Structure formats: C-alpha cells, structure tokens
C-alpha cells in the first residue's frame, strides 16, 4: 500500500557505532567462597 521512508534499524555487522562500556570495574556483592573455621578460617578454592 506504501513504501514509506523511515528508519531501518541496523541489522548488519555494526561493529563501531555502539560502545559497550565498563568504568569503575565490577562492583557488586557476592562472597560465596566462604568456608568454615573458628579463628583461623578453613576456606577452600571456590565462588568467584
């Protein structure tokens, strides 16, 4: 009914118009490598 001129949102190999960033590199809470000890804590390798 029409070929209306409009925006073709890019689906090609668009490598460099967008920039996925990271500044102040990773900051969040996750401490799941804890192990059991009393005063000298017996932790292992694990978690993050």
């Amino acid at each position, epitope marked *: 009914g029409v070929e209306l001129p409009c925006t073709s949102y890019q689906l090609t190999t668009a490598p460099t118009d967008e920039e996925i960033d990271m500044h102040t590199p990773p900051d969040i809470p996750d401490r799941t490598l804890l*192990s*059991q*000890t*009393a*005063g*000298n*804590v*017996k932790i292992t390798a694990g978690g993050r």
Partner: nanobody
Framework: QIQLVQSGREVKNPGETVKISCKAS????????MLWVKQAPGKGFRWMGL????????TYAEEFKGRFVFSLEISASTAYLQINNLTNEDTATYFC??????????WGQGTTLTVSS
C-alpha cells in the same frame, strides 16, 4: 587455651530458665567459634549451634537451639546458654566447643542438668 568453661550440674525448673554460663575464653568468644551444645540424656552433645566469633554471632541448631537459647558477650568469652522454658522432657547435658577449621579445635567443659522443678 580452649576453656569453654560451662556451668555445673543442674536441677532445672520446669517453666523457668537455667543459664549454663559458657565463659568460652582462650578458645572463641571474642574471635572464634563458640559451638553451642545441647546435651542428650542419651543423645550426647547435640546441636545448639555455633558461631565463628570475629564479628560476634551465635548460631542455633534444630533440636538444642530453641528452648535452650544462648547469649554471648564474647569479650571475656562470656556467654550463657539457658536451658529454658522448662519441661520434664527438656533436661540433658550441655556443652560448648572452641573451634578452628569449622569442626571444633578445642573442647569445653559443659554441665549436666535434669529438668525438674
């Protein structure tokens, strides 16, 4: 040295509380695990919980934590486990542990108390 010095024996009042005082010193009150211990009349040293003591928390178990409720001012190793809300089917031994490598690394003396008001 790991001196989880408990209270002595007991004839514990039904409906009341009895605070077996775990002076858990040299082992962990103020830095290390105070392992809270209910004591079975058959069951032996049963779980009232445990706590690594660098921050200052005691932790509870399923069968001994509950009616036995314990508090802990760990600076002198001070704490007290109340065999409390007493019934005739509530009495047993009691104990603690002074931990390291999350099983206990030293053993505390405990006290045996039979629930009878």
């Amino acid at each position: 040295q790991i001196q989880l010095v408990q209270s002595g024996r007991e004839v514990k009042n039904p409906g009341e509380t009895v605070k077996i005082s775990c002076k858990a010193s040299g082992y962990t009150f103020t830095e290390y695990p105070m392992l809270w211990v209910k004591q079975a009349p058959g069951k032996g040293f049963r779980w009232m919980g445990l706590i690594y003591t660098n921050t200052g928390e005691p932790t509870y178990a399923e069968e001994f934590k509950g009616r036995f409720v314990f508090s802990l001012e760990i600076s002198a190793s001070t704490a007290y486990l109340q065999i409390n809300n007493l019934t005739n089917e509530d009495t047993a031994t009691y104990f603690c542990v002074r931990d390291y490598f999350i099983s206990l690394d030293y053993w505390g003396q405990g006290t045996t108390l039979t629930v009878s008001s």
